[PDB]
DNA sequence: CACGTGCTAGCACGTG
DNA sequence: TGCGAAATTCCATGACA
DNA sequence: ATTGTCATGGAATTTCGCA
DNA sequence: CACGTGCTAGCACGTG
DNA sequence: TGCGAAATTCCATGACA
DNA sequence: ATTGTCATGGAATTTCGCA
């Protein structure tokens, strides 16, 4: 009883007048369309709101309605939202209802051998005691190399990539932060050959999209070929590699082989259209195709997405959350906005993290 | 007839024996007939056996219309002729003791033959490990007759390791 | 050489005239804008198409373009699609590009105790040697009961449901074809009490949506409550059960308790709005709420969906497909269309199956 | 004052001992004060201990404003009074030897007391298993004074098992 | 004992 | 009436599987 | 022989206190 | 040895 | 020209994770 | 310090053979 001048009939900002505010039992009541409710002082509200919310750690509306049952005051929701911003457990467990910003469609690498994309497929069914495949996809062309390994180790990634780099050396190699790739040994091997290692954000395999999406064609064709047969794939990687490199992307009109060489080699259904040009008149035409290749632009934003601004409160999807454990880390802050879709955060540990917005939800309230 | 192109002809040959680097006593030399590109495959002997192992790795990337070689045992075997036909690779044969090539291939097989041997005394009996660097140099070597590298004629762009 | 009258200059239906059809090497050729292509007889086409497709079991376009390299004939695609309809491996591995029809929103059960929805949550973290929860959700109200079990057995489902049915008996009980529910023992227990067992389609948990979506609120609140604490949940099922039954659905304006009783019991923030009516004037009002409760209608169809007609060729998502094994069964036929979204098929074994269209793709071609 | 409603008052009492059916020698009787609804909980003794076990199962469904009982040991304990306060359940007590109720509750506690005993000789020393059926009958029994069942007054609709 | 159906584990690698 | 602020409703986005 | 669901919180929108 | 990151196993139950 | 049939392009829907 | 991708097959649409 401090803003109680309403009992004498005095006006207090935010309190309507066309009602009558009496007293009963020792409590300031108010007659309402809803019924008759109890107005507590400012001092007693924050506590009541909490009591109510705490019953099932309910959201804005569900929390208000429980209080509606007994109380009215000016802009109760204002007090309730204040509380949901403070409740630690709700903030770290409730999922989000805001979708990521629309995806970026990175420019295709300019030249063959600009960027290399890598990932490991497996474990697979043991064929000749091999268990994994190292897939190496060239950015620009989409030419793909397939190396059977006994494990996804630096040890064996190096082995393969040597046999590979005999043909050429790439400027950039991009991979998921897979164990074998983020080793120091690999950093060495790459430093030595003078190649820049570029790394995907964690738990975000669209980043390695080019490989993953080639993986698909690799698993798919392997399967079609191993139907009715027991799965011995080792002896098929050769057959798959060639076939895939030599299959047309409809929206490009070109095989990765073509985008890498300008003429087919001696493979079935060999295109001879550039037969009569000199190699020089032909290699020129290629420079042309490579420049005007179809390229997609970002799709429109979702009606209810969000994009990250500096110093905004933001939380990170828990790596591998335990059973019955919250799916979000303690809230954090945006430091650098590398693009509309990648952000560096003051991590919860409290490092620097470069994370995809996908593994982020904007903190509510 | 119609202009020369890559994958039209691969010229192959063995080189050895050499000083035992991890058991590899020979080297298979494949050179593209038009771009003069070079692939090198360390083998333990000049047998069809290891000629196949190696040309498989290669023919998984790209496939020649024609392979041309000396009448070396490995090349003239049935095994190899069967392996060839299977893939629609035509076999051509340099008539004995009088070797055959275009200008380009003759010199490249030479470049290698000597470039191999220099980094055989200069960096001694551990050569195996260096074949990749050799191969890169070889394919990034500049051409007089056509003022372009193998790596240029083959891929149509500049190497990311010029020489 | 049978439709070769084109060499003399005769016309054959479907072959254009403004070109010139010569002979070279012993093959009928044609001069084209594309280049110069080879026309083979009818007898030689089907084989060529196959050769081409077989290279990477390519789709329509990717298969044509490989043939484009060497050949032209009238409506080549017509021949190519014919072949993709016959290739077994492509039909059983290629995914689909047609989405399911839009979902149905089943009428809410009319009265409390019309329909019961059940499922088992777990395994969980061992609390007092209990590992699972049997969740029982009432259709109409959404009142929910929570039974801790040591395993998801009939043995123990029966145990719980007895304690439950002491309050009332349900007309219908709906569950996923979970082991313990599709036992004969359970059929018995249910036959005895005279309750009809209604079963969800396999591998389609939206069917048990009402439970699953309550599961969510159950796991969510459990977590919020077990933050910082080690996960001992046994002693919390009581607390959760009450709290959840007594939390407002915003779009309904009512707690499941209210929809089941018409007044709150003695729980925090007790609504007293129907205080002054007789129990009779009150129980009547309830009959009213129950009738006019918000209900959603099916969302619009996707631009590129499909719906099942009788006798259509259709294939079934493989239960648990092995590694490198195709994700679809041999194609089959629609017998009965139970609704726009459930279908009975001549199974591949070759039984009757009642499957959701979600686990179905229309056979292509 | 204002009209009667459910959950306003639960009337509780023990019944026993009875013939040992799987160790359960007693039965806890809870009756809603207004609808005359009945819950039955088989216990091994009339202790606070098992009175709590059982009223927990019940108060997880719904919670009375008031519990009313005889001054039986279990009901008058501190343990129970603490358990009560914790939940905001008011305790009321029938003054010794002169039992208290409304019309309705007196007769229902009777119905049970006798209905229990009939299916105690008619179906003998295995009664435990049958309490659920008893409870259903009890709650589906027709009322003279209000022409509606407990199951009707409580849920506001017809039972799916009428009696 | 393998098979159908409804759930979460598990193992890999390189580094600290 | 009509205008600004409050309050209630709208809804798409996720997690249950 | 069967079928998705609903808490949630910014945003959109309809109701309210006062002239 | 436990921790971070990129992969598939695995176990349950009731029935045949 | 302009009209029917063919042929090529459009694209959303899934699987790679 | 970094970013999704592309085979696929009905459907939509633009090009073609012939007047
Ligand atoms: Zn909370
Ligand atoms: Zn196929």
List strands and helices in order, with pairings:
The structure is a homotetramer.
Chain A lengths: L22 E2 L2 E5 L4 E3 L3 H12 L6 H9 L7 H9 L3 H6 L21 E7 L10 E7 L5 E6 L4 H12 L6 E4 L8 H9 L3 E4 L9 H17 L11 H9 L10 H6 L17 H13 L21 E4 L15 E8 L2 E5 L5 E5 L3 E3 L3
Parallel strand pairs in A: 4-7, 7-8
Antiparallel strand pairs in A: 1-2, 2-3, 4-5, 5-6, 9-10, 9-13, 10-11, 11-12
Helix pairs in contact in A: 1-2, 1-3, 2-3, 7-8
One zinc ion binds next to helix 4 of chain A.
The structure holds six DNA strands.
Would you write up a description of this structure?
The structure is a homotetramer. Chain A has 365 residues and is an alpha+beta fold. Chain A has four domains: 3-95, Endonuclease III, domain 1; 96-103 and 302-363, SH3 type barrels (Roll); 114-247, Ribonuclease H-like superfamily/Ribonuclease H (Nucleotidyltransferase, domain 5), CATH 3.30.420; 248-293, Arc Repressor Mutant, subunit A (Helix non-globular), CATH 6.10.20. Chain A contains ten helices and 13 strands. In chain A, the strands form three sheets. A five-stranded mixed beta sheet of chain A has the order 6-5-4-7-8, sandwiched between helices. In chain A, α1 (42-53) packs across α2 (60-68) and α7 (209-225) packs across α8. Chains A and C meet through α2, α4 and α7 of A and α2, α4 and α7 of C. The site of one zinc ion has 5 residues of chain A, from α4. The first copy, chain A, binds six DNA strands through α2, α3, β4, α7 and β10.
